Amino acid sequence: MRPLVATVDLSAIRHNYALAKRCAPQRQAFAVVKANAYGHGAREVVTALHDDADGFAVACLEEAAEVRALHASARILLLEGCFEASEYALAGQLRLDLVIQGAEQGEAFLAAGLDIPLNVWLKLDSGMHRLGFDPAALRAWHARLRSHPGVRELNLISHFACADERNHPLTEQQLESFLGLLDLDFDQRSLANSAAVLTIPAAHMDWLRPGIMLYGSTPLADLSAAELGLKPAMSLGAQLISLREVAVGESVGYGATWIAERPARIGTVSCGYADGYPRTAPAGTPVLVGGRRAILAGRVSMDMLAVDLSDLPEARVGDPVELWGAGLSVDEVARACGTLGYELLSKVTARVPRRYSH
Amino acid sequence: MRPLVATVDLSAIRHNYALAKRCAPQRQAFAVVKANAYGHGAREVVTALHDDADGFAVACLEEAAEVRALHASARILLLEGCFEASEYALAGQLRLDLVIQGAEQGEAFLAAGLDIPLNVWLKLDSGMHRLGFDPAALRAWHARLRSHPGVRELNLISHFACADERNHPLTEQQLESFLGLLDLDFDQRSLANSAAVLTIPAAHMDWLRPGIMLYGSTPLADLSAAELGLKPAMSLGAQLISLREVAVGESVGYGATWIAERPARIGTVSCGYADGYPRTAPAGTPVLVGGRRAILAGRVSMDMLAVDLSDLPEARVGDPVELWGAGLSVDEVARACGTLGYELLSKVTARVPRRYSH
Numbered sequence: 001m002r003p004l005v006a007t008v009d010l011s012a013i014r015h016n017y018a019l020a021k022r023c024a025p026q027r028q029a030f031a032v033v034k035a036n037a038y039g040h041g042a043r044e045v046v047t048a049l050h051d052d053a054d055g056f057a058v059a060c061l062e063e064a065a066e067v068r069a070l071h072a073s074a075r076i077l078l079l080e081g082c083f084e085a086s087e088y089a090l091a092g093q094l095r096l097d098l099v100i101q102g103a104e105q106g107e108a109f110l111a112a113g114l115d116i117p118l119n120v121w122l123k124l125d126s127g128m129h130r131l132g133f134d135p136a137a138l139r140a141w142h143a144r145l146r147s148h149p150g151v152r153e154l155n156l157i158s159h160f161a162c163a164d165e166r167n168h169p170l171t172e173q174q175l176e177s178f179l180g181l182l183d184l185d186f187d188q189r190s191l192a193n194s195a196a197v198l199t200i201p202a203a204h205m206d207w208l209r210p211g212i213m214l215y216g217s218t219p220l221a222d223l224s225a226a227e228l229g230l231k232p233a234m235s236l237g238a239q240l241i242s243l244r245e246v247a248v249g250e251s252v253g254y255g256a257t258w259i260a261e262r263p264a265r266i267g268t269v270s271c272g273y274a275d276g277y278p279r280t281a282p283a284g285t286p287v288l289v290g291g292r293r294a295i296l297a298g299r300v301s302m303d304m305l306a307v308d309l310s311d312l313p314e315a316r317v318g319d320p321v322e323l324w325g326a327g328l329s330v331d332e333v334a335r336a337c338g339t340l341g342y343e344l345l346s347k348v349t350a351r352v353p354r355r356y357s358h
Numbered sequence: 359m360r361p362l363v364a365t366v367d368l369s370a371i372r373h374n375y376a377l378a379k380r381c382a383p384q385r386q387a388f389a390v391v392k393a394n395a396y397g398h399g400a401r402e403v404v405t406a407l408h409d410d411a412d413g414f415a416v417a418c419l420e421e422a423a424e425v426r427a428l429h430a431s432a433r434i435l436l437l438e439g440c441f442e443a444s445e446y447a448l449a450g451q452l453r454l455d456l457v458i459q460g461a462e463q464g465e466a467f468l469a470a471g472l473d474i475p476l477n478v479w480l481k482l483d484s485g486m487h488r489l490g491f492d493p494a495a496l497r498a499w500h501a502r503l504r505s506h507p508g509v510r511e512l513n514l515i516s517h518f519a520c521a522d523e524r525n526h527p528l529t530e531q532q533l534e535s536f537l538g539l540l541d542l543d544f545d546q547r548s549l550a551n552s553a554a555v556l557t558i559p560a561a562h563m564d565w566l567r568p569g570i571m572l573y574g575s576t577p578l579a580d581l582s583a584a585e586l587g588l589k590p591a592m593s594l595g596a597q598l599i600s601l602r603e604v605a606v607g608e609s610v611g612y613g614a615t616w617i618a619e620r621p622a623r624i625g626t627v628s629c630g631y632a633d634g635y636p637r638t639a640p641a642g643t644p645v646l647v648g649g650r651r652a653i654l655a656g657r658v659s660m661d662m663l664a665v666d667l668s669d670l671p672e673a674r675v676g677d678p679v680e681l682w683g684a685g686l687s688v689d690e691v692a693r694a695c696g697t698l699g700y701e702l703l704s705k706v707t708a709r710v711p712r713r714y715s716h
């Protein structure tokens with residue numbers, strides 16, 4: 001088989017979830033498992049956290065349906081709520097926690113006429129300015145929904161825009177904006193993402209919403225996952241499929257963007273952008289070969305990648321290549337590529353086989 | 359359901375394939391369908407090109423097995439050959455065309471001792487400098503393999519590094535390298551990718567290898583798919599799921615990257631980087647709202663994207679959003695994102711449903 005495997009350490013995820021829990025020991029935490037549990041496998045992640053998780057949060061009904069099929073009783077939150085009229089009936093049947101974040105969505109809920117009472121989370125836009133109500137509108141919808149027969153729990157949710165930064169003004173502003181609604185009778189309040197879980201105890205409220213940290217990728221711009229005690233879940237391992245000698249002045253890969261200055265050893269790796277790796281990953285991007293540090297040379301192809309092995313003379317065809325995992329953080333690779341671990345993990349494509357360990 | 363669908367026009371692929379064949383009508387053409395037919399769905403693309411295609415080219419044995427399952431007799435080329443010794447027996451069962459690029463791989467084929475002779479394509483490294491033999495080694499391997507009992511067809515293959523550019527020096531070097539071997543007895547010669555199929559008739563040889571052009575994305579740096587008469591295969595459509603008023607000095611999305619300079623109208627779209635969209639898509643990346651041109655505002659998140667709707671007063675929640683397709687070229691969007699159509703197309707993730715048009 002093509003030597004490229006994503007290994008998922010499930011005990012790391014449980015460890016990381018327990019760690020998030022320890023940040024607010026008397027409180028509750030959603031396991032955010034949207035986008036196929038951030039590329040790790042929603043079915044397997046929900047199974048590993050079946051008893052551990054206070055609840056689950058997802059991006060859509062398709063994902064919610066998948067979680068419910070696996071956990072018959074657990075709390076499942078639709079982070080974006082329902083997208084259309086026909087979803088409400090199914091949401092009722094699967095006993096989902098709903099989000100109302102706009103007027104259209106709120107009017108759709110009212111028009112649905114569901115018999116079964118559900119928990120409804122009203123979304124405050126506290127500065128992100130994408131989804132959510134402004135305070136006046138949320139107050140209006142709190143009034144219309146508090147004593148509604150189909151509402152079991154009326155709750156409050158909002159999201160930080162810059163919680164990853166150690167001291168961005170908007171963070172404190174959002175927190176104070178969230179507290180501007182302390183007067184309204186809410187059954188639950190939720191504010192904290194991974195970054196907030198770890199660094200803003202005042203925002204913990206009732207339900208934490210850790211996503212990225214569960215997978216051993218840092219939510220913070222200034223602290224690494226290793227510094228935070230998070231264990232990496234995904235190991236994307238490949239192999240050296242080719243070794244070449246490249247003479248001075250000769251180029252490597254598309255566009256002839258990499259030119260040898262000295263007699264060079266160039267290794268080809270069984271990983272490309274069709275696997276999820278960034279196409280535009282620059283020269284100098286780290287990679288591990290036989291557990292040793294090396295760097296990218298030349299453009300990343302659809303199915304192949306190239307590395308400079310001029311300083312690794314013992315490296316041979318067949319040697320294991322770690323793109324990211326326990327030895328090289330997905331965050332380090334991501335940053336060198338001008339992006340975040342979020343993206344690298346999310347986009348590991350279907351063609352990449354998944355293994356699961358403990 | 360979540361309002362995000364990748365609509366694939368299969369008859370556009372048939373059209374683009376016939377256009378590739380018309381570049382060299384007396385010659386044959388491989389339909390390059392690797393990486394799930396560049397995200398378009400290998401099963402459906404191969405079915406559409408079941409009789410049209412002279413043969414198929416893929417990146418690995420797994421992909422080849424899928425193709426053989428659908429077409430019992432078609433020529434299937436493994437572009438990178440077999441990755442390990444144990445693959446050869448299966449490659450033999452599936453009656454695949456093999457590639458030999460390196461000494462290790464060549465030795466593995468020799469050692470395999472297969473039951474049936476197979477077509478063998480020897481790969482010349484003509485300047486790409488990742489895969490393939492130097493001219494001397496290829497001549498040596500030709501001498502070994504020309505009357506070897508396990509070889510049915512002995513062929514020559516190489517691949518351009520800069521055929522996307524108008525007249526790059528390396529393109530001539532690569533062509534001269536290839537031609538310098540044509541004193542040797544070869545059954546088939548293959549050199550031309552999409553770029554070369556359209557612009558380098560001297561590279562046409564016996565078998566063309568069009569990939570990207572099949573899907574209506576330009577392979578060339580300075581001509582567009584429309585100018586080349588290529589019909590776009592994939593249409594990625596979403597919807598406005600939210601619409602907001604944003605005051606001057608207020609920010610949008612993570613990191614507060616986008617700050618409103620006039621009273622702004624801002625819409626949220628049901629597409630994000632976990633769907634395959636580039637996370638780092640900058641401000642000014644084009645989008646269509648109700649068929650009308652508009653630009654991105656704020657960081658792309660995992661499941662959501664934001665657009666500036668200030669100059670489209672009639673835009674409403676529920677309106678269709680074209681991320682790319684027949685209205686807006688995947689090539690234009692990719693150029694704005696500092697990458698190519700290849701990446702955007704082939705990274706559309708499993709959770710984006712594919713619909714096929716008729």
Ligand SMILES: NCCCC[C@@H](N)C(=O)O
Nearest residue numbers: 272301302303304417700
């Ligand atoms: N980037 C262009 C797509 C073709 C890349 C080709 N060298 C491969 O990895 O299969």
Ligand SMILES: NCCCC[C@@H](N)C(=O)O
Nearest residue numbers: 342630658659660661662
């Ligand atoms: N980039 C962080 C991912 C979370 C973003 C969240 N707003 C969403 O799109 O669901």
